[PDB]
Design a protein around this nucleic acid. Structure first.
Lengths: 258, 184, 187
RNA sequence: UCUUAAGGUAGCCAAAUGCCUCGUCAUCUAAUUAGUGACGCGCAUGAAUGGAUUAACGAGAUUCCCACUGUCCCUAUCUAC
RNA sequence: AAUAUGAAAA
RNA sequence: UAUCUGGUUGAUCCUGCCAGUAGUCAUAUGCUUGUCUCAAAGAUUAAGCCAUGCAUGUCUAAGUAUAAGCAAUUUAUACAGUGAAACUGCGAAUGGCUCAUUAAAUCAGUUAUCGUUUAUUUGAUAGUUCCUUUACUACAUGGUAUAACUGUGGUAAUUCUAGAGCUAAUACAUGCUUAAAAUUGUAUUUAUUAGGAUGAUUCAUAAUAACUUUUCGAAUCGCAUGGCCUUGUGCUGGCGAUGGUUCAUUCAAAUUUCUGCCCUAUCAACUUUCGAUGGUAGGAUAGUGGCCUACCAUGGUUUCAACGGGUAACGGGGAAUAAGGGUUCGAUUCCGGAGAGGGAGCCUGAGAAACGGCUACCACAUCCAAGGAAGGCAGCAGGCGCGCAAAUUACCCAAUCCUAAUUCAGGGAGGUAGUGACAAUAAAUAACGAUUGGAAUGAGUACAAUGUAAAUACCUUAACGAGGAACAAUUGGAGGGCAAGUCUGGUGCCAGCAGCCGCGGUAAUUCCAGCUCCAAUAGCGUAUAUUAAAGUUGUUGCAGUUAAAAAGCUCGUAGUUGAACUUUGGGCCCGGUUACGGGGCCUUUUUUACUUUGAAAAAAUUAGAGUGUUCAAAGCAGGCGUAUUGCUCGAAUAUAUUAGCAUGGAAUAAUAGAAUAGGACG
RNA sequence: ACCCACUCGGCACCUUACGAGAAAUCAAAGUCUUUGGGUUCUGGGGGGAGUAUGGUCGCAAGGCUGAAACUUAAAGGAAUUG
RNA sequence: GCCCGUCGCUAGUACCGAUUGAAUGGCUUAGUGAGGCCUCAGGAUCUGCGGAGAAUUUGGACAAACUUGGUCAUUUAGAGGAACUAAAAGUCGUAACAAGGUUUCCGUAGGUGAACCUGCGGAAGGAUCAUU
């Protein structure tokens, strides 16, 4: 290893991609982008295996090249673009519109949305600085940078970004009561409300999250994503609304809806 | 390269290979069920031992334990669906009380014989392996096909099998042609 | 190439480490610049990440700052007189950081005369009013008072000629100037 | 079994003591009557007619090795008397 | 008071 | 599925080991060999050597095309389409292989970068480019080459190329159109000043005086050609691609905190001349740092096992076997290292100590026309050698991906096929009738179609294809453990058998044969290693009088262990579960070890949920429709020891407190 | 000095065997599969062998530490009956 | 009955062993030291007071590699010597097992063809648990 790595194998691929282990040696290695190699869904896996629209990688490339596909407000043509957590993917030719989001099992859901909501997206502001010429700016989890934010917007808040033009539509603060989306850890995809934080010095901060059914759990602050008010989400959530029932309860639900 | 293709063994040969009582019992089973090798009884006994180990580890758990309930209901559900267990004996201890005879009796060989499509168990195996018997509506030539609880009702001759109303095989055709040639 | 890895140095417990890997570029060192005086000659050395470093040699002049005044002027370098690390650098007139050097005094002297209207050693109305406003600024200490008469200023070199290519520095003043003068005259 | 007063013990050796003898084996060398290490039915080794070993020492005797060179191949030249 | 030895398997 | 059995003896009870038994994704080998799926495969000895041929090249509408190329200006006189050759930009630093070197090294978990670099992607980001401060500028826009080519040639020879004449740039070296808003960009460096965030900073950012050999701030390209009139080749004007400084993001990288590694005292002292531990200062670094250098102090590790040696040692995820504990293995499909025959040095580049890149030496080794030249298969095949030990010098970019200018090209990465009793799944060698007959079928062929990049096989199926001498199942064994011959012939302590006990010397249940029988069965045996058995490694859980073992005795440092005592008991309520556990109050009211809970702990693997791949190994597929509409369930679940992080408790066990009181309060 | 009774500490002894052990036997060789008061040393079948070697002490004789190749199905302990 | 040792034959294993033995690998003092790199210079040639710049070349760091020594580790030859083990019937004795016919054994010392004998001290694993 005397340089960057440009390959990924199926076993080394993240589990939530749900690639099979026997069809091919390699996995689609995400190119550099707004999100990390992990916790990000490439368009090839979002089309070939998620939506089943294309049967092979070559057909995925053809779909991408004829420009039917645009992540956020801009068309994407690279075969393995790293579409991350709250990225909105359009596919305007079929008039659908999805926003990526984790199902309660801990995988990218195929949740569809309307254009009236796709016209925006949220982002957990991950850093706040003052750029050149004394201008403040915020940078969110998808590397997106917005200049001149409201002074009340601090780290761990959520900023609503219009896809037409990067601009702060509004923001959601981080305090007790706010509905949050646990993006990271054993509670991948779980949704609940914050009761209180811990705020350790030096170490990783902790937050206690309880959900609609009053199942209190704990998670690092690096894996939470506040998405709206108390029981008033700013986005549409997939089926289940971020509640994980037990294995027996899931089996009972499956057999009752058989 | 490609990710390894996982595999496992379906039986376990016993220690003290040479017990007269064990040999006599397994030969009794083989003779009265038409089993070709001791490997079949070894596989059946290995499945029995595996499910019995699971059942014992399950019974060791405290009652109404979530894992105990989930795994126990799953195990008994699959047992009754296979038909090795019976509906009345739905409790978990009957899994322990099970014997290899139940699994050997839920096989496709003996189930064909019980349904009566065969003269003997060996006749049943011969018919099964010559693609004559068909579960549901598809040809199957597996003597050890564990019949589900909703498959014995639909066990019958294959549509393609000459005994299933199809073209009368090959030997019958050859002899009919010979007879016609002689009579011509 | 000079290796910066600790895999060659003896372990803390005296254990002779074994040769694990061949030498690597991301730990390579380079020879010292050893910048002399006169006829500026800076060679550009490429550095990891595609960056540029100015390996200076034979530098002519440098920007020297009078921290009390806040100003800084380009000045020719008379030569090193005391180096804390090695006296060899003093002997061969090598320009490195923290070198105590003598530099020319005329630019700073002219600036002082034109900004405060006084003199060391030994006309418009706006100028007179400015000097009246800046009165009592000729209170500059006796060290630099005699320094400007001597015509050379003692300055500490604060740049890295082997890295930045420049020999910028700042004029010795007060306690540190007294310390370095005492070191010079310690005999 | 003959016989003596007793029959060379401990040891050591072709040793400076072994005729046959340039003993036999090994090593040293391309080649070794030489050297060294072993073998000992030793013509004729051996116990204060002292046996064996021995650090140091030796203008003692001997073998090999490195360095060194006109000892030599193979001679030539210079100086003084 | 002198008395030593008795093959190999079974 | 927490189990043993034969063997010392005339016989017994023990210690005790030998032997038997079973497994081994554990190897070799012997015999035998039909079918389906799946699949390991030159690691062991030689990281030994390599013939040969391939494995890294790449272009759009969008860098440069007057090829003296193709096809056309039916769109055009600068070109217009395509397009070899070549310059240019990227990549070649990925992948693939091997496991030699490596014993705090790598590596795993866990940390830090307030200690730094980071091509590319993503998102932002240069009126001050008149600043050398309004033509340095030609700005309806600048300069020179030079490639490609023709011709002349040299060399036996190389992916050698010289001399001459041509010619472009997003190639190089320059350079404006920025008005002017305020108070002069940005980039580098120095010194000074203020200072939204962090647990914390000299942080982020801003203001001054300057420095700079000077970075950047668009002379690039393809489409669409639209609006304004004072109609001019005027003024404005879209979609992009490419490029660009800084910041952030991403892909990373380099260092870094704690903890953890096999056997060795027949390795006890080691490091410290000349770097050892640390301080100051400087170079060097991308950056911290004895990384290096100068001065200075004499330090650092160690019987809690240093230093040294061996490793038939890459580390881990994991594998085999196990009641619980544990033992052994992990070259190898995934992660991280290191290597390209050994060793060093280095160019380019963001990225290399790069070897399918150079430089030198060493060791190999090739062609020479005897002057010269060119190499690293531990990639793919393949050959030699080494061995007990391991396959074809095949087809293809169709998947999975990867790269490039990039949908199109390329890829021995990868897939397919060939060999393949390494291992796994299923399962033919026969069934019925009457006392000799019909009926069925797959092996093996084969029109056909599916299959596939094209194929081979598989799934299907016209037709052919069972009656035994056929379409014939072997491998071991018959005294015991360990069921199965007191049958026959041969041999006569010979041949021979025999894991052990033992059999055999003219009546062999034991050798060689026949018959019969037995165990496993397309598999069986043999050898080696390892595991269970092994309570024969013993923490759980051994033994020491006599079986092997208590040192001759005592002292004693390290180590292990170490007498008790410090808050108890009692009342009053609250709220959980069906008394069981929590909480609050009243009754005078300093460090740890430990222990509960949680975060965090890659997949693959393990246990396990669902799912008729015809079952099963497997796999994560699938299922239900009025099937011309379409809808829809999934792809869970637990571990995770040690180490680190937070957290509830104060029993247990250490640990200090105020005794010449400078002791608390206040 | 005795006698009797008691006590502490010794060398022991006699009878049993609760208990232990394979047994001989054992008030410890007991409080052991109902297996954990503290700790030191030693053994892993019999040999080869307390040998070779490397250290180390000794004037020497020898002492301390101390293997391996190889070989073997017994060696051994306690009792019984002859 | 059993059994011990010397000696005799055969085979195997290991040890000592002159040979300043021999190989392979690691580290290293010292000497020589290629090569690329940085640097002091040198400036062919080409270009508009300048610019680029080849051969060469000064010092420095990195440092292959070769030689000679030193050390460590792993193997390994060796005349001869002295052992051990094994193998149906070899010779000499009878040392032990009984009071093994001199009770045996331990340490130590001497002697001797061989077991072994003897001296001193010790043990019973003695052939005595015993003399008020």
């Amino acid at each position: 290893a005397r340089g960057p790595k440009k390959h990924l194998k199926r076993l080394a691929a993240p589990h939530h991609w749900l690639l099979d282990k026997l069809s091919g040696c390699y996995a689609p290695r995400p190119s550099a982008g707004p999100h990390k190699l992990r916790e990000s869904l490439p368009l090839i896996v979002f089309l070939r295996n998620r939506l089943k629209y294309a049967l092979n990688g070559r057909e995925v490339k053809a779909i991408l090249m004829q420009r039917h596909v645009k992540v956020d407000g801009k068309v994407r043509t690279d075969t393995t673009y790293p579409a991350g957590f709250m990225d909105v993917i359009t596919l305007d030719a079929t008039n659908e519109n999805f926003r990526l989001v984790y199902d309660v099992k801990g995988r990218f859901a195929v949740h569809r949305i309307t254009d009236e909501e796709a016209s925006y997206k949220l982002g957990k502001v991950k850093k706040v600085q003052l750029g050149k010429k004394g201008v403040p700016y915020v940078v969110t989890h998808d590397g997106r940078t917005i200049r001149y934010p409201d002074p009340n917007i601090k780290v761990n808040d959520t900023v609503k970004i219009d896809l037409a033009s990067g601009k702060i539509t509004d923001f959601i603060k981080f305090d007790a009561g706010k509905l949050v989306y646990v993006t990271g850890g054993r509670n991948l995809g779980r949704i609940g409300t914050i009761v209180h934080k811990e705020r350790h010095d030096g170490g990783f901060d902790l937050v206690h999250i309880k959900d609609s059914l009053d199942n209190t759990f704990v998670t690092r602050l690096n894996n939470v994503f506040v998405i709206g008010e108390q029981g008033k989400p700013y986005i549409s959530l997939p089926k289940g609304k971020g509640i994980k029932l037990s294995i027996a309860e899931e089996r009972d639900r499956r057999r009752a809806q058989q | 390269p490609r990710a390894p293709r996982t595999y496992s063994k379906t039986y376990s040969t016993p220690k003290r290979p040479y017990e007269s009582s064990r040999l006599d019992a397994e030969l009794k089973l083989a003779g009265e069920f038409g089993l070709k090798n001791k490997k079949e009884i070894y596989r059946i006994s290995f499945q029995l031992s595996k499910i019995r180990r699971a059942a014992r580890d399950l019974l060791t758990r405290d009652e109404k334990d979530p894992k105990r309930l989930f795994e126990g209901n799953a195990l008994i559900r699959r047992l009754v669906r296979v038909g090795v267990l019976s509906e009345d004996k739905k409790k978990l201890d009957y899994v322990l009380a099970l014997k290899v005879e139940d699994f050997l009796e839920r096989r496709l060989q003996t189930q064909v014989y019980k349904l009566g499509l065969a003269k003997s168990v060996h006749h049943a195996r011969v018919l099964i392996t010559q693609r004559h018997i068909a579960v549901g509506k598809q040809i199957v030539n597996i003597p050890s096909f564990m019949v589900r609880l909703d498959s014995e009702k639909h066990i019958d001759f294959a549509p393609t099998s000459p005994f299933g109303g199809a073209r009368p095989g090959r030997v019958a055709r050859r002899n009919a042609a010979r007879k016609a040639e002689a009579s011509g | 190439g000079i290796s910066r890895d600790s895999r060659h140095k003896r372990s803390a417990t005296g254990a002779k480490r074994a040769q694990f890997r061949k030498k690597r570029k991301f730990e390579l060192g380079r020879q010292p610049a050893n910048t002399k005086i006169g006829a500026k000659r800076i060679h550009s050395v490429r550095t990891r990440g595609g960056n540029k470093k100015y390996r200076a040699l034979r530098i002519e002049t440098g920007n020297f700052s009078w921290a009390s005044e806040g100003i800084s002027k380009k000045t020719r370098i008379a030569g090193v007189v005391y180096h804390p690390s090695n006296n060899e650098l003093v002997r061969t007139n090598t320009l490195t950081k923290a070198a105590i050097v003598q530099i020319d005094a005329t630019p700073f002297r002219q600036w002082f005369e034109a900004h405060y209207g006084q003199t060391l050693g030994k006309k418009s109305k706006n100028a007179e009013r400015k000097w009246a406003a800046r009165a009592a600024s000729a209170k500059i200490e006796s060290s630099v008072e005699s320094q400007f008469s001597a015509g050379r200023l003692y300055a500490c070199i604060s740049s890295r000629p082997g890295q930045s290519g420049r020999c910028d520095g700042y004029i010795l003043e007060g306690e540190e100037l007294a310390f370095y003068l005492r070191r010079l005259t310690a005999k």
